[PDB]
C-alpha cells in the first residue's frame, strides 16, 4: 500500500493477480528487475505481445 | 462417414486446419482458435452414445 501514493507511477499493470489483494497471501522467492528504457516501449514490455 | 466428415468444420474459428492457424498467427492468440477446434472435435467424438 505504501507503493501506491508516495510515488505516482506512470503505469501500474498487475498481471495474473489483483493489485489490492497482494497483502494477504504469502508468495515464494520474489524477484525484482531493473533497467532503463524509452518511454514508448513501456507498453511493449508485457507478456505475450511481441 | 459422418464422423469422418466432421473434421472439416470451423466450429467458430477462422479456419479448420491446425497447420494453417499455427503458421498464420502467433500462439498467444491462436490458443483460443485451437481451443474452439478442440472443443468442437470433443463434442463430435462424444456424439459413442
UniProtKB/Swiss-Prot annotation, chain B:
At the highest ranks, the source species' classification is: Viruses, Riboviria, Orthornavirae, Pisuviricota, Pisoniviricetes
Q: What does this protein do?
A: Subunit of the fusion protein that is processed upon entry into the host cell. Mediates fusion of the virion and cellular membranes by functioning as a class I viral fusion protein. Contains a viral fusion peptide that is unmasked after S2 cleavage. This cleavage can occur at the cell membrane by host TMPRSS2 or during endocytosis by host CSTL. In either case, this triggers an extensive and irreversible conformational change that leads to fusion of the viral envelope with the cellular cytoplasmic membrane, releasing viral genomic RNA into the host cell cytoplasm.
Changing residue 22 to F: what effect? In strain: Omicron/BA.1
Q: What's the protein called, per UniProt?
A: Spike protein S2'
Which residues of the intact protein are shown?
960 to 1009 of 1273
Where would one find coiled-coil regions in this protein?
1-34
